[PDB]
Amino acid sequence: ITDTLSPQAFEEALRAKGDFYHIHHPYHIAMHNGNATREQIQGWVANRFYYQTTIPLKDAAIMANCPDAQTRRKWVQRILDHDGSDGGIEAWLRLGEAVGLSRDDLLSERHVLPGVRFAVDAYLNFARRACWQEAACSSLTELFAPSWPQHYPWIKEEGYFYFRSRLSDVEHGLALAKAYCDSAEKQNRMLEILQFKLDILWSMLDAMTMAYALQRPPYHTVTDKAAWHTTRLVLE
Amino acid sequence: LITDTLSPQAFEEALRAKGDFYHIHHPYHIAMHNGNATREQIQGWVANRFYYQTTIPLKDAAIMANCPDAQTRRKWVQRILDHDGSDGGIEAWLRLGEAVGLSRDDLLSERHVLPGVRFAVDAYLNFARRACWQEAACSSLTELFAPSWPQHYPWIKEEGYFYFRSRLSDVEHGLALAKAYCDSAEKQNRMLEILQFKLDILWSMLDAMTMAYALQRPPYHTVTDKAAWHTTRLVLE
Ligand SMILES: O=C(O)c1cc(C(=O)O)c2c(n1)C(=O)C(=O)c1cc(C(=O)O)[nH]c1-2
Ligand SMILES: O=C(O)c1cc(C(=O)O)c2c(n1)C(=O)C(=O)c1cc(C(=O)O)[nH]c1-2
């Protein structure tokens, strides 16, 4: 971008990035067409649960950096949504039981791969350090975001549906990129922040590929046991 | 898992046992060491290891920003001096890059650095920024586990290669710190966890490079042939 794009040209630039959305990863494709194994489904739920539990922290980090009462009023709804005040992280826990993991397997974080954790912690850390407009606008990948019964009859229906139901906002993070990125300076940088975010989603699934699709989890050449660290070190 | 506090020497043994997990046991390191790596693999290893290397001094400065002990700073700043020159260990990597057929701009641009590498390496710097200075200083200890190309890869250039091995050539410090500081079972167990963390970073970097250069599945390989990952230290620049 050399000349400042208009609001609506900047929008299509932002959406042209949906071309790299994680639905295009082979791990995501082998899941939604029924070729994924039990280990792969459960491995996805457990790792993707890590992303889900970090997002309210990421959103709270944005609010800590935001002197604007009005924006905080609207942004806190994201935390209310995940934590419940119910709540989206409870939909993830029932999905975990639906695929044969327990609450303490998910809650413990032990199955979470180091490569997923690094990719997810990258998001949190960016949110912590970046100015709030920029962190807030990275949530925008959920524009690109909107079957398992037939595919995997072993998944419990009861829990699987509670995952679907519960998953009952972006009218924001887009109305704000266009409203904050009024130079080629800001636009270029927003497209790069957006790319960052897409890389995080792609890397989570790369980490899952190596471990569950390729039988190359960390240290596979040294042990058959899980040996990675399982702690959020700076928080716990 | 430590139930009863080990002696400092028993506790050194448990730290050193963690070398079983050192990144030399990764198939990507092994393929390089025994001559089965492609030039693409080697060049991408140098390009990506470079990012780790230019981050070390940032990480060391972070420990220092957190260290109110002048005496430790005096020892710790020496690592920055060795990396940055006063050249320059980072220069040794740059000359290694040229010997494998990368330009200095290739390396300094950080264009070729894979997101998986960036995230692992940035994890290390972020821990040093936020952890107390002792825990962060002790995570440097994987260096204890550290200490054939011309024959397997005769297309590697002589001078840059030699210069890299030359400029090659501190650690009696950070183990002393761990033995002195980790004086409870809780500190011990947490320090083995912080060392696992560090080990995981090293391993994750090689996984990222495996996916990209050994398996031909770099990010967005199903969408584009081109590098489309982000290439920026977003918070720093
Ligand atoms: O705050 C955020 O940034 C954020 C981002 C994303 C994302 O990047 O797609 C999701 C969510 N939240 C979320 O709650 C969620 O259920 C979700 C599902 C997906 C997906 O494609 O599977 N992304 C996201
Ligand atoms: O080649 C290797 O296997 C290797 C590993 C490590 C390590 O264990 O972190 C370092 C280095 N090399 C290295 O050259 C270096 O300057 C360095 C600094 C540090 C540190 O943690 O501060 N590790 C390493």
Contact status, residue B212 vs residue B229, Cβ threshold 8 Å = no
Q: What is the dihedral of CA A138, B206, B219, A235, to 10 degrees?
A: -20
Q: From the list B211, B223, B230, which residue is nearest A196 (CB)?
A: B230
Q: From the list A118, A193, A221, which residue is nearest B25 (CB)?
A: A221
Provide the 8-state DSSP code for B6: -
- Ligand 2 surroundings by CB, under 6 angstroms: B 56, 140, 142-143, 146
Which residues of chain B neighbour A224 with C-beta distances below 8 Å? none
Cα A142 to ligand 1 centroid, rounded to whole Å: 6
Q: What is the DSSP string of chain A?
A: --S---HHHHHHHHHGGGGG-GGGSHHHHHHHTT---HHHHHHHHHHHHHHHHHHHHHHHHHHTT---HHHHHHHHHHHHHHH----HHHHHHHHHHHTT--HHHHHH-TT--HHHHHHHHHHHHHHHHS-HHHHHHHGGGGGS---HHHH-TTS-HHHHHHHHHH---HHHHTTTHHHH--SHHHHHHHHHHHHHHHHHHHHHHHHHIIIIISS--TTTTT-SS--S----TTT-
Burial class of residue B215 (count of CB atoms within 10 Å of its CB; 0-12, 13-18, 19+)? middle
Number of Cβ pairs closer than 8 Å across A and B? 129
Q: How far is CA B61 from the centre of its chain?
A: 16
Min distance B139 CA to chain A CA atoms (Å) = 12
Among B74, B73, B181, smallest CA distance to B134 is for B181
Domains along chain A with CATH numbers: 1-236 (1.20.910.10)
Min distance A164 CA to chain B CA atoms (Å) = 28
**Looking at ligand 2, which residue's alpha carbon is closest to its atom 18?**
B56
Which residues of chain A neighbour B216 with C-beta distances below 8 Å? none
Q: Which ligand is nearest to the CA of A119?
A: 1
**CB-based contact B235 A130, cutoff 8 Å:** yes
User: Does the beta carbon of A139 sit less than 6 angstroms from any atom of ligand 1?
Assistant: yes
Which residues of chain A neighbour B203 with C-beta distances below 8 Å? 114, 218-219
Among A6, A14, A15, smallest CA distance to A184 is for A6
Phi, psi angle pair for A205, to nearest 5°: -70, -25
Among A79, A83, A107, smallest CA distance to A93 is for A107
User: Does the beta carbon of A142 sit less than 6 angstroms from any atom of ligand 1?
Assistant: yes
Burial class of residue A172 (count of CB atoms within 10 Å of its CB; 0-12, 13-18, 19+)? middle
**Looking at ligand 1, which residue's alpha carbon is closest to its atom 14?**
A52
Q: From the list B115, B120, B211, which residue is nearest A210 (CB)?
A: B211
Q: How far is CA A97 from the centre of its chain?
A: 20
The pick from B24, B143, B145, B194 for probing ligand 2's pocket by mutation, whose C-beta has the most ligand atoms within 8 angstroms, reads B143
CA distance A121 to B121: 12
Helix (H) or strand (E) holding B145: none
**CB-based contact B127 A234, cutoff 8 Å:** yes
CA distance A131 to A121: 17
**Residue for token digits 């079957």?**
A147
User: Does the beta carbon of A55 sit less than 6 angstroms from any atom of ligand 1?
Assistant: yes
**Looking at ligand 1, which residue's alpha carbon is closest to its atom 22?**
A145
Q: Which ligand is nearest to the CA of A170?
A: 1
Q: What is the resolution of this structure in A?
A: 2.3
Which residues of chain B neighbour A199 with C-beta distances below 8 Å? 115, 219, 229-230
Q: Exposure string (b/e) for B157-174, b if CB count within 10 Å is 16 or more?
A: eeebbebbeebeeeeebb
CA distance A207 to A77: 31
Q: From the list A20, A119, A200, which residue is nearest B228 (CB)?
A: A20
**Residue for token digits 């997990």?**
B21
Cα B144 to ligand 2 centroid, rounded to whole Å: 9
Specify the amino acid at residue A157.
E
**Looking at ligand 1, which residue's alpha carbon is closest to its atom 8?**
A141
Alpha-carbon torsion A148, A152, A155, A156, what sign?
positive
Provide the 8-state DSSP code for B26: S
Experimental method: X-ray
B120 contact partners, CB below 8 Å, separation of at least 6:
A114, A115, A118, B200, B201, B202, B204, B205, B208
CA distance B37 to B236: 34
Among B89, B83, B119, B103, smallest CA distance to B43 is for B103
CA distance B58 to A200: 22
